[PDB]
Design a protein around this ligand. Structure first.
Ligand SMILES: Oc1cccc(O)c1
Ligand SMILES: Oc1cccc(O)c1
Ligand SMILES: Oc1cccc(O)c1
Ligand SMILES: Oc1cccc(O)c1
Ligand SMILES: Oc1cccc(O)c1
Ligand SMILES: Oc1cccc(O)c1
Ligand SMILES: [Cl-]
Ligand SMILES: [Cl-]
Ligand SMILES: [Zn+2]
Ligand SMILES: [Zn+2]
Lengths: 29, 21, 29, 21, 21, 29, 29, 21, 29, 21, 29, 21
């Protein structure tokens, strides 16, 4: 529900930072 | 997946990098 | 400057929002 | 790609939707 | 209002649009 | 409370992006 | 560059925090 | 508007408060 | 679920806007 | 610390001000 | 300068994530 | 400091760690 939705918003922020030029795949599953 | 691994307990940036391309 | 870097941070946000359960691939390049 | 298309002028959420899985 | 609607369950983009001017 | 507070934060960002040039009204009560 | 768009994103976040329970209109010109 | 007013020089908390309901 | 971590992220964002040019120390201890 | 003070109940911007340099 | 203001907002989020339990000292001046 | 360093070009995660306590 909402707390997983909010958490995913931060997860993608952290991936953006850590992955750098490599980028990333975000797939809830 | 990522939500399962990382929304219940904190993932470090090191753990998160496993999801990079 | 770091303009592209700040822009990408907002882009992954907006992708997160619009893509919903599909998720997305972020690859600069 | 996304940076060239969307960082010089605004992309709508509909345009961004092209980059969805 | 929006908090009651959208903080207990995920609102869709179209539901959120109710709050646009 | 805090939770609602954190949620409202993401709500205004989502409104910003979805509403575009229309703008939006955030009235939490 | 999408500077007004990125600025407005931080502005609504700032308004969210300042206005608290009063809420706010965001009405871009 | 707010974008014109606050996107070149920083609006303080105080100034921003003028835009609250 | 990860809610101190998420709260802390919003907290730094809010401190940033309150503190301005003064800056701030963030010590999670 | 701040997390204890401000993550169970909401801190005002004035309360937040305590942590500025 | 608003450009600096927006950059700093992303800087503190990045520091929040990278510094972890250490915390960080944000001092722009 | 951090602005002169990291707002004029992109800092690596190791460069940002300079500013950790
Ligand atoms: O485990 C998590 C969840 C969300 C953001 C993050 O950096 C780590
Ligand atoms: O063109 C853009 C750039 C960054 C965020 C966004 O929603 C659109
Ligand atoms: O229901 C919600 C809550 C927060 C952000 C969003 O896009 C939807
Ligand atoms: O002038 C501004 C622009 C964006 C955020 C803010 O707090 C102030
Ligand atoms: O108490 C809090 C926690 C997080 C953000 C904020 O503005 C206040
Ligand atoms: O140089 C920078 C500026 C802002 C965020 C970041 O991760 C790096
Ligand atoms: Cl959150
Ligand atoms: Cl920005
Ligand atoms: Zn959040
Ligand atoms: Zn930004």
């Amino acid at each position: 529900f909402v707390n997983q939705h909010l958490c995913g918003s931060h997860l993608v922020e952290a991936l953006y930072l850590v992955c750098g030029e490599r980028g990333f795949f975000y797939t809830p599953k | 997946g990522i939500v399962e691994q990382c929304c219940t307990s904190i993932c470090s940036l090191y753990q998160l990098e496993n999801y990079c391309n």
